[PDB]
Design a protein around this nucleic acid. Sequence first.
RNA 1: GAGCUGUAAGUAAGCUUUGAUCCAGAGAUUUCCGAAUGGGGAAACCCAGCAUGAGUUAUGUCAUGUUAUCGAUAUGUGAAUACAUAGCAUAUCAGAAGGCACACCCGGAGAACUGAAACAUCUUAGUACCCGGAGGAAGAGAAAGAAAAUCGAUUCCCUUAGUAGCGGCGAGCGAAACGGGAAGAGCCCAAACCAACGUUGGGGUUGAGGACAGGAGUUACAAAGGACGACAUUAGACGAAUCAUCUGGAAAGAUGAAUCAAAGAAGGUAAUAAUCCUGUAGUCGAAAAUGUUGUCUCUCUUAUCCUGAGUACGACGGAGCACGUGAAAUUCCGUCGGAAUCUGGGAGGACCAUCUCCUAAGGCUAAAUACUCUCUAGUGACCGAUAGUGAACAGUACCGUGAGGGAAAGGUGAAAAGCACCCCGGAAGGGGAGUGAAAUAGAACCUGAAACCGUGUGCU
RNA 2: UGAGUAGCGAAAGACGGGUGAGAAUCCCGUCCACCGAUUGACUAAGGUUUCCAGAGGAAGGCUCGUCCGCUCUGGGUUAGUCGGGUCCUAAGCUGAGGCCGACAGGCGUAGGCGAUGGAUAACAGGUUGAUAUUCCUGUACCACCUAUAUCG
RNA 3: UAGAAAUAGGUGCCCGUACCGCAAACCGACACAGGUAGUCAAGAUGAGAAUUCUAAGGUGAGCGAGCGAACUCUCGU
Lengths: 89, 44, 64, 94, 51
Amino acid sequence: EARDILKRPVITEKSSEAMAEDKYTFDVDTRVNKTQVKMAVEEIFNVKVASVNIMNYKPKKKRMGRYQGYTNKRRKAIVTLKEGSIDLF
Amino acid sequence: VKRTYQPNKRKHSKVHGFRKRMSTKNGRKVLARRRRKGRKVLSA
Amino acid sequence: KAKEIRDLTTSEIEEQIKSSKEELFNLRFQLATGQLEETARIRTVRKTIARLKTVAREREIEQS
Amino acid sequence: HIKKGDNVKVIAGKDKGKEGKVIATLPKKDRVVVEGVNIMKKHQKPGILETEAAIHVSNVQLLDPKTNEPTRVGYKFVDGKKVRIAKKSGEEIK
Amino acid sequence: ASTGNRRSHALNSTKRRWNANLQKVRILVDGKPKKVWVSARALKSGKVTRV
RNA sequence: GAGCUGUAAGUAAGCUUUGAUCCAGAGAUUUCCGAAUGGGGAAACCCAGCAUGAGUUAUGUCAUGUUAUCGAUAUGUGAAUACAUAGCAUAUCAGAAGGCACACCCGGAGAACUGAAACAUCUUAGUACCCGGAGGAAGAGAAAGAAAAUCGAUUCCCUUAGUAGCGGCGAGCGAAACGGGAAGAGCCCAAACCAACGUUGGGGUUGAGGACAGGAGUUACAAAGGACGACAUUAGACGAAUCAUCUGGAAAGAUGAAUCAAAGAAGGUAAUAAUCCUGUAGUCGAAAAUGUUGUCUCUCUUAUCCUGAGUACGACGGAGCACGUGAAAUUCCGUCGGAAUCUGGGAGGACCAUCUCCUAAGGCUAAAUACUCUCUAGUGACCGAUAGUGAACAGUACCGUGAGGGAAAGGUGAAAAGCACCCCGGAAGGGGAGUGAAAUAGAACCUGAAACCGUGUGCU
RNA sequence: UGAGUAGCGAAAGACGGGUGAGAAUCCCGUCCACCGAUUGACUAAGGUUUCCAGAGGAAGGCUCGUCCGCUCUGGGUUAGUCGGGUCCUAAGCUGAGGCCGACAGGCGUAGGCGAUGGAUAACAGGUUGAUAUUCCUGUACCACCUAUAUCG
RNA sequence: UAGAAAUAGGUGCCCGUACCGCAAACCGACACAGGUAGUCAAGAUGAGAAUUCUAAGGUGAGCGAGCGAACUCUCGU
Ligand SMILES: [K+]
Ligand SMILES: [K+]
Ligand SMILES: [Mg+2]
Ligand SMILES: [Mg+2]
Ligand SMILES: [Mg+2]
Ligand SMILES: [Mg+2]
Ligand SMILES: [Mg+2]
Ligand SMILES: [Mg+2]
Ligand SMILES: [Mg+2]
Ligand SMILES: [Mg+2]
Ligand SMILES: [Mg+2]
Ligand SMILES: [Mg+2]
Ligand SMILES: [Mg+2]
Ligand SMILES: [Mg+2]
Ligand SMILES: [Mg+2]
Ligand SMILES: [Mg+2]
Ligand SMILES: [Mg+2]
Ligand SMILES: [Mg+2]
Ligand SMILES: [Mg+2]
Ligand SMILES: [Mg+2]
Ligand SMILES: [Mg+2]
Ligand SMILES: [Mg+2]
Ligand SMILES: [Mg+2]
Ligand SMILES: [Mg+2]
Ligand SMILES: [Mg+2]
Ligand SMILES: [Mg+2]
Ligand SMILES: [Mg+2]
Ligand SMILES: [Mg+2]
Ligand SMILES: [Mg+2]
Ligand SMILES: [Mg+2]
Ligand SMILES: [Mg+2]
Ligand SMILES: [Mg+2]
Ligand SMILES: [Mg+2]
Ligand SMILES: [Mg+2]
Ligand SMILES: [Mg+2]
Ligand SMILES: [Mg+2]
Ligand SMILES: [Mg+2]
Ligand SMILES: [Mg+2]
Ligand SMILES: [Mg+2]
Ligand SMILES: [Mg+2]
Ligand SMILES: [Mg+2]
Ligand SMILES: [Mg+2]
Ligand SMILES: [Mg+2]
Ligand SMILES: [Mg+2]
Ligand SMILES: [Mg+2]
Ligand SMILES: [Mg+2]
Ligand SMILES: [Mg+2]
Ligand SMILES: [Mg+2]
Ligand SMILES: [Mg+2]
Ligand SMILES: [Mg+2]
């Protein structure tokens, strides 16, 4: 289930600035806790995790012509590595 | 001057929410009427 | 592929499910980093997993 | 009943009387693209492209193998297979 | 209890009920003694015996 | 049987004659809320117990199952209290809950405006609303009947008949039997009485009978199953016959000459097509599932006593009967009283006598009948965008705390061929040049009336 | 039509420089002026992306607009200790059994839910375009777990 | 009451967290002279959180330019 917990890496200027400090940002499944995220990261990337910070993002109002709607709600986890490194690219 | 509507999330949910409607036969009648008419929104 | 799956032992089906889920995970990470561009591989692996779980359930229902 | 690669005669439209190979088939719209038939001039932004525009399938007709006259096509069975056959002659269509 | 009409001398109609003459006695229901409301006419009939 | 990855263009990356997309039958998967049921809760969320399993030295975390209440069964255990019971714990069952087109149906409960030219009896009306229960129908049903020469369960249609009658005899309300039809079906108990250890079997079921002395069937009349066949439904397949010229952007139109027809229904195709396409008449077709069905089978069968008791019935108060308590029989409810036992009992519109018909106080029963959210196939001297659904593109937008109210909005062209390129302009917008039959068909796109707004000027 | 009419919603602006097709209205600067028991700062409710950056100027903005709480594209909210839950109860709501009621239902025992109150372990500094007692640095505390020697 | 340590190392979940917030974002159909709970409380003067001017900090109010008639409104003599 570890590969169901982690959906995708988040690559932004802020997330790259965090990567410079050995912090890796992932979009995760909205139903998981940060302990599950830590275990999933450890299982997938064979690294040691110092800590996990997690946050929720509300759906964003969005439109395409007369069709207004929302984006999906998101859960964002920032994973601080104790040892190892993650080669996303 | 103070107007009639002073919004309150808790008050609104407790008086008009889904569970309050389910709590009485007439509230369930409201839900049935709104389902029959085809409303997108059945309650708060 | 259902014919090819049908010739594998139950444990092998489980072994292929795990490795297919690993390849699918890798494809998503490549896509999110703008490095895949071969986007049809995602649906192929997804349906293969579906087929693998379909047969596993079929045999787990013939045994019981 | 009209397939890609077929030799067809155009029996209605501007190019009525011309023959050509069926380049493409659009079964959902019931239209075919016939080489050299219904040439459109489109204004390409990044010249004037000249290419075929589809015409309705009912405006083309197959030509009989023997008489080389337009023919409607029926169907017959030979060893569990459906084969196009001409109405005018009855010989199987390629 | 049945519903009917109370009728005035001018025949004005008003809805009314006719209640049974229920009396609270113990009748040993389903083997177990139990105080239940039972009509006096039922007690006269004899289907239900008290105590 | 060649394209395909929805609407739905666009690429990108792919799938597909080693048979894809697609259609039908059957399977598998099926998050969370919701009766929602482990507990809570402001629905789609939060928090747990127990058992089992991952993981970790270990805790934290996770996975899977299970845990509502009331019923049901069966194992204990235990009060006041001695036996007991109430109660309590545990296992097993998975019976109920909630929803609806809930339109038709049965029941409980039940208005008012209104009419009476006021109004109370009466009417609206046992209607509207509310509540309960179900079914594909429901209800009714096998004479204590209709009647007055006899019929023979119920229901429904016609008629009787706006009659008889009811009615502040006002306004109004308003039958039934006979006759003609649709459909058609009859049955099971309780009792006496036998066999056995009061409870089970046997027996019996009515207008005088009972006690005693192969043919019928799962549609009631008892109830579970199999074999084979049939048909139909849910995908589909085949399916006759036209060419030429003219005008046109385009022919199906006109003209000339042909053909098919169990097919001249219809729709499409660049204008109006029986013969171009999809079809039509007609014929063919099912691996699978679902029905309805026939045969075989398979089942079952060969007046001494009794005859429904707190009943019938009666008084008082009400209700239902077309009928308002009246000459009011007939049916039901509350309260109170309260029979008879084939020499019996009930009805025939108060009541009595005779006569005649029937045999209450237990139950079951198809069909003819009611309705349509639906499905399949069709139809219309029905609408054609202010019409027709509120809605051709929406119970949306919007309004309201909420219940709730509730719009506007269809058309380029045959085909996007949707205007390359040049010029003014920041753009918008234009003038050319092209496409097109047409661009005053350029997307605010068929036609483009009137109000209204401008420019020019013949007379004034 | 009324009609280029009424209005354009409490107030102090001036100039320089810039940008631009276009500037009283945008940016920057200096001077001037207004609030200051507040026109300042921080919490709560309520709203729900309006926040940040880059690009834009049809519509919206009572004028203008190069600007914007407007449009396009891409981003932004980090907690063992803050507030709430895994703690507690009040009013009130609900309520196994239970009592009552034509139906529907009403009431109520144990119990439960329920803060506006009770309990409860983290502080200072730094840092971004946008977060910070949450991130980083420094120094702590609390609960549980394990390892190396009475509880009630 | 019945009843039946230090030290070292490790672990610590969910929800909220942007922004406005006495308002241009909340309630008032509006970028509306209104309504909106609590907290922080500088200096001069003063009894004072009155008054006037200032600090911190914020702001110049989303139409302007002239003219300086009647009349209307607010203000002074
Ligand atoms: K055609
Ligand atoms: K924050
Ligand atoms: Mg957090
Ligand atoms: Mg649920
Ligand atoms: Mg639940
Ligand atoms: Mg619950
Ligand atoms: Mg059960
Ligand atoms: Mg159950
Ligand atoms: Mg129903
Ligand atoms: Mg029902
Ligand atoms: Mg009247
Ligand atoms: Mg009901
Ligand atoms: Mg019902
Ligand atoms: Mg055919
Ligand atoms: Mg044909
Ligand atoms: Mg022709
Ligand atoms: Mg009898
Ligand atoms: Mg009556
Ligand atoms: Mg009567
Ligand atoms: Mg009478
Ligand atoms: Mg009588
Ligand atoms: Mg029109
Ligand atoms: Mg309409
Ligand atoms: Mg043009
Ligand atoms: Mg132009
Ligand atoms: Mg031009
Ligand atoms: Mg043009
Ligand atoms: Mg024209
Ligand atoms: Mg037009
Ligand atoms: Mg005007
Ligand atoms: Mg003027
Ligand atoms: Mg005027
Ligand atoms: Mg004036
Ligand atoms: Mg003015
Ligand atoms: Mg102003
Ligand atoms: Mg001042
Ligand atoms: Mg901004
Ligand atoms: Mg403007
Ligand atoms: Mg914006
Ligand atoms: Mg209660
Ligand atoms: Mg009761
Ligand atoms: Mg509190
Ligand atoms: Mg900030
Ligand atoms: Mg903040
Ligand atoms: Mg603001
Ligand atoms: Mg303003
Ligand atoms: Mg304001
Ligand atoms: Mg205000
Ligand atoms: Mg003071
Ligand atoms: Mg002051």
